[PDB]
Structure 1
Amino acid sequence: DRKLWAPGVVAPEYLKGDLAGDYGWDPLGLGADPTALKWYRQSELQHARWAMLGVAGVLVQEIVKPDVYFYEAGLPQNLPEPFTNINMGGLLAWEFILMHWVEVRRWQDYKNFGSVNEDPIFKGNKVPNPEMGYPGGIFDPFGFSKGNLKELQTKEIKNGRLAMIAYMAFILQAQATGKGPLAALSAHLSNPFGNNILKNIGTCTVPHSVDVQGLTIPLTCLWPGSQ
């Protein structure tokens, strides 16, 4: 009885509202294999949660530091004063080691549900992990999981899906116009007709490559825009 993505369209058999934010949308039928549907559901949570942090970071960073131009914020010379011109090789080493640990733990949970709940060092500590992708426990200090969990999952995925669309709008707008999200919004308001996608779509403002501390990094736009 739930509303579907389009009017008068039959939902797939395997989509029966069990998961949150289920509109019965699967034109490519990628969820037919039950095991594949679980894996894709996790990746939807990862993209949804990472994307929401991405959108929040870009917007908040723009307000505090308007001139950083987040697209270029990755360059070492643009880093804050404490970290300015830090050796990117050492900086990457922290991320690889720390993310490899965290992500393998999450991966092992998917392979064998409930195996990696307990802390490895300090015996006794554990997380409830009521459902895969929702560890809870220490990950939910405020205890919002208690109550109408189903509704909260719906709110999370719906906002997360919107963030995914919104963030890729930031990327394409930066590539085409060369301005951040808020800056582009101001430009449209000033001259709604002269300054819009109909004009900017044909230009890609990203240089072909950059030199990061002597290492050349290729760059591209998402379409063959006029460099």
Structure 2
Amino acid sequence: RPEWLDGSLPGDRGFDPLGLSKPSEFVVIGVDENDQNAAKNNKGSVEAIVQAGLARFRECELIHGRWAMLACLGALVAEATTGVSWVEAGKVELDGASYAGLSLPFSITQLIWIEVILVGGAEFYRNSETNPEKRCYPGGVFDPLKLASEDEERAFRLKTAEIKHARLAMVSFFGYGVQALST
């Protein structure tokens, strides 16, 4: 069982077969001399041992799973309501733009310009924050029902609910990736 985890975190379990989030030590080697005007150039030396990202890794699972939960819930119902495969969208939308059977006026060239402005600028604003708990869990308009007044630092698990559903949605879309080309 790992020791560098299991506290103040939703998935309090040591699943890691390899310890990707292991805080490792570091040692700093000096820069090698490359001056020709010296007679001898040395290969550098050990200078500084450094004692030493679980906060960075927590944010990056949350983004992938939430895109997966928009993907898995979005591919089952567009296959249900419209009646087209989730891989086939793009081949049938370049020909005719639609949403739930309703024709849309946009050329496919405009969709590149729409998506890199709208989704792009929103992605440029997410990394404009410098607090890792606020980066994982922001406030403001994204919490209209006030989860942030409810605590989870104790045995309360009011935050440990998206994180399990983010996990298998990545897996069920990984199951969609092993099904698309092959089968």
Instruction: Tell me the TM-score normalised to structure 2 length.
Output: 0.71
> Deviation digits for residues 97-119 of structure 1, max 9, x if unmatched?
1222211211121xx229xxxxx
Match of 2:131 in 1: 113
Match of 2:103 in 1: 82
Q: Distance in 1 between matches of 2:22 and 2:76?
A: 38
Q: Distance in 2 between matches of 1:90 and 1:61?
A: 22
Q: Distance in 2 between matches of 1:134 and 1:161?
A: 17
Q: Between Structure 1 and Structure 2, whose CA radius of gyration is higher?
A: 2
Q: Distance in 2 between matches of 1:32 and 1:135?
A: 26
Q: 2:113 aligns with which of 88, 93, 97?
A: 93
Q: 1:44 aligns with which of 61, 72, 75?
A: 61
- The 8 Å contact of residues 97 and 104 in structure 2, kept in 1 or not, is answered as yes
Q: Which amino acid aligns with 1:137?
A: G
Please provide the CA RMSD for this pair: 2.3
State the shift of 1:17 in Å. Answer: 2.6
* Pairing 1:176–2:173 present: no
- The 8 Å contact of residues 72 and 169 in structure 2, kept in 1 or not, is answered as yes
* Structure ranking higher on relative contact order (CA contacts 8 Å, 6+ apart): 2
- Taking structure 1 as reference, are residues 78 and 29 closer, same or farther at Cα in structure 2, changes over 3 Å only? farther
Shifted more, 48-57 versus 131-140: the winner is 131-140
- Taking structure 1 as reference, are residues 78 and 43 closer, same or farther at Cα in structure 2, changes over 3 Å only? farther
Shifted more, 148-157 versus 42-51: the winner is 148-157
More helix per residue: 1 or 2? 1
- Show structure 2 runs of 5+ residues with no match: 25-51
* Pairing 1:146–2:168 present: no
Match of 1:18 in 2: 8
Q: 1:132 aligns with which of 123, 131, 135?
A: 135
Percentage identity across paired residues of the two chains: 38
Match of 1:156 in 2: 162
- Show structure 1 runs of 5+ residues with no match: 1-9, 115-129, 178-227
Q: 1:28 aligns with which of 18, 22, 31?
A: 18
State the shift of 1:78 in Å. Answer: 5.1
Instruction: Tell me the TM-score normalised to structure 1 length.
Output: 0.58
- The 8 Å contact of residues 20 and 157 in structure 1, kept in 2 or not, is answered as yes
Q: Distance in 2 between matches of 1:176 and 1:30?
A: 30
Q: Distance in 2 between matches of 1:83 and 1:135?
A: 34
Q: Distance in 2 between matches of 1:74 and 1:151?
A: 40
Q: Distance in 1 between matches of 2:149 and 2:180?
A: 41
Match of 2:28 in 1: none
Q: What's the secondary structure of 1:146's corresponding residue?
A: coil
